[PDB]
């Protein structure tokens, strides 16, 4: 009595023939590399915690099980629960409402949920939309753990977002190549990014004022 295994097997073994595409025009099943897909579906966490899960279950699993951001680590090539849940999100293909909830409301309560949502958005969304959605969270300064060679190292949400926005490979996953932000700006699709701090000149003026006055 297990339709779940059948559905998963169907998704993994072939897609795009009977697969709805991501908003960026990619096929969700092939967004992550085949090798990594193998490492995930074979993994214990996938088999015991991702089996037949739901979008609600996604939040529950994130709170319960993810303690860091990472791809595949160690000699055994174990995929992080974070990565596995990302792959599951690729499977579930959640809509804008669910992503909105995860990111803003869930993200406010659970930082790793925001990290997951941001990752998924970078994976599945058009470049302009990705910049517009993710750039505000450069103001999110909450601490995150990232999986290193032994244990974990410290990073921050704004650093993770910046990585998503500026790097080709994140969490053992190749991110679809994007038009650079300056290209979008040149094409008038995007205005230049506005920092919460303001312009560099403004920062210089405030700095000079703070220095001149006694402090």
């Amino acid at each position: 009595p297990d339709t779940h295994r059948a559905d998963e097997r169907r998704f993994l073994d072939e897609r795009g023939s009977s697969g709805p595409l991501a908003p960026n025009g990619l096929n969700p099943a092939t967004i992550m590399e085949k090798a990594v897909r193998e490492r995930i579906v074979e993994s214990y966490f996938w088999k015991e915690q991702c089996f037949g899960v739901n979008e609600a279950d996604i939040v529950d699993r994130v709170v319960e099980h993810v303690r860091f951001v990472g791809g595949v680590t160690g000699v055994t090539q174990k995929p992080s629960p974070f990565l596995c849940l990302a792959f599951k999100l690729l499977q579930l293909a959640p809509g804008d409402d669910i992503l909105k909830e995860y990111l803003y409301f869930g993200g406010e309560k659970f930082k790793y949920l925001r990290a997951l949502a941001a990752f998924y958005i970078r994976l599945t969304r058009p470049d302009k939309e990705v910049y517009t959605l993710l750039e505000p969270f450069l103001e999110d300064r909450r601490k995150l753990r990232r999986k290193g060679k032994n244990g974990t190292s410290l990073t921050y949400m704004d650093e993770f977002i910046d990585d998503l926005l500026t790097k080709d490979r994140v969490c053992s996953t190749s991110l679809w190549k994007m038009r650079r932000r300056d290209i979008l700006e040149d094409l008038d699709l995007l205005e230049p990014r506005v920092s919460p701090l303001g312009s560099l000149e403004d920062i210089l003026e405030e700095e000079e004022q703070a220095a001149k006055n006694e402090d």
Binding site: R193, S195, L197
Partner: protein
Amino acid sequence: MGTTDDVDPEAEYAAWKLRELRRLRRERDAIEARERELAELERRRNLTEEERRAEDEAHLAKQK
């Protein structure tokens, strides 16, 4: 390991401020680089026929 937020709000905000400043400086550097590119473009545009010929020949013979 594990992470705990807001153990020292002031310090954490200061650190974030430096990170954001770093991003801002990166953006500024990019802008200046682009302006240098436009400057060189314009410079090429204003070369005479013979000047451009001499320049391109010099570059080619140099790469040779």
